Amino acid sequence: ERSSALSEVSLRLLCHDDIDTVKHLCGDWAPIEYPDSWYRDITSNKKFFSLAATYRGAIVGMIVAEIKNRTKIHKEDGDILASNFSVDTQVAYILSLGVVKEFRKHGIGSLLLESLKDHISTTAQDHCKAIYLHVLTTNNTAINFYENRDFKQHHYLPYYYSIRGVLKDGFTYVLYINGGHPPWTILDYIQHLGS
């Protein structure tokens, strides 16, 4: 019944009319409260690649990502790429990837991820050197899914408490593409040169 689901799946861009659905879906995935303006931006702004997967015409999954130059990476994650990659270097940040619970394990998430990769390849060619994202420490399912897909856990991000707000702890996961890699230690060089 459901298991036929991929056969009935289509892909389309998110749009403004989807905002209520997106809030509901995002809300199911995590408890965070994004502002209305955020939802408006991801749905409508071309700067983001926002792609929905629909089952029988209804959204059951989405991926939202931004392709950006390396200088746009937040300092917490500044060390994902080695210094020898130029400021012109690009990365893709996955703001959100999610699939409705009933529809998981049907390949929808994989399809969304692959579509992003295809988009990057077309759009940025070899210039984009990494895809990175944040996951909550608690998301076993997500972590397993990314790890199986060659993402590496770059580092732990601690709880953040400030007058500005509060952040839960998390991990940064990175998939390197087109020769991208993290900064190398003396030992890393020693091995490459040494052998």
Next chain:
Amino acid sequence: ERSSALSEVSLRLLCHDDIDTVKHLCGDWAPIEYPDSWYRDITSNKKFFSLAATYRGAIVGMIVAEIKNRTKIHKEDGDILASNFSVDTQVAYILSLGVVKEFRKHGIGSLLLESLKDHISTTAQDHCKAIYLHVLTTNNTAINFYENRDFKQHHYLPYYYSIRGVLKDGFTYVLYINGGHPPWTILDYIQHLGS
């Protein structure tokens, strides 16, 4: 009546019994929701310098700060101190400074700040090289107070949106002490050497 307030002010450490009061006061200053554990930590943990100002025995202001090694600074603020200051270098982060609205402009805030400076001087001597804090962009009163007190606006901190949570925008303000300074550009060196 109120104007006599400083004459009736005393200073004491925060303690566990203060948690409800602290929540109420902090809540008045800003809308952020810290967890109970945070309040428990600032009130009870010696790692923090948490000092209250009381008027007629009731808390009307507080300062909470942590003296820490430079490696403990978050990456967003990693560039507050120049690289030539050693990893052994210390800084103080002001988690909170606040005074009840009725009691403002009586010198309580200044007193709290000064007490922190005295504490740093006693505790860390010349080893601590900066005091830094975060302010919301909207806090005109706070900004004026710090600026008048020789704090400098180091940089803007943008809104942060992620699965981990949401942060409002802000500024990092820094007061340099004991010869501390930010990283120097080529031009900075050119001037020092040049003239």
